[PDB]
Amino acid sequence: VTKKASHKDAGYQESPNGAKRCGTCRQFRPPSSCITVESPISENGWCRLYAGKA
Ligand code: SF4
């Protein structure tokens, strides 16, 4: 079964970046998954590969 990108390979941190977090993001998948990144991921652990969407 195919794997996501690691939170590491996605450029993540342990806190939000200003306006941007996980939580809902443009890409978050509650309670602990992501559409960019592997699970378990933090509900505030923002990644650099998150979607450029408005
Ligand atoms: S794409 Fe990145 S910032 Fe967005 S929810 Fe997933 S890990 Fe977080």
Q: Which residues of 16-40 are buried (b: 16+ CB within 10 A; e: fewer)?
A: eeeeebbeebebbbeeeebebbbee
CA distance 5 to 9: 6
Rounding to the nearest 10 degrees, give the CA dihedral for residues 30, 34, 49, 46: 40
Closest atom of ligand 1 to CA, residue 48: 2
**27 CB within 6 A, ligand 1:** yes
Rg (CA), the chain: 10
Domain range for residue 25? 1-54
Which experimental technique did the depositors report for determining this structure?
NMR
**47 CB within 6 A, ligand 1:** yes
**46 CB within 6 A, ligand 1:** yes
Per this entry, what is the length of the chain?
A: 54
Structure tokens at 35: 């559409």
Reduce the secondary structure of 1-54 to three states and give it as a string: CCCCECCCCCCCCCCCECCECCCCCCCEECCCEECCECCCCCCCCCCCCCCCCC
Q: How many separate domains does the chain show? A: 1
Phi, psi of 20 (to 5 degrees): -110, 125
Contact 45, 7 (CB under 8 A): yes
* Residues facing 17 on adjacent strands: 20
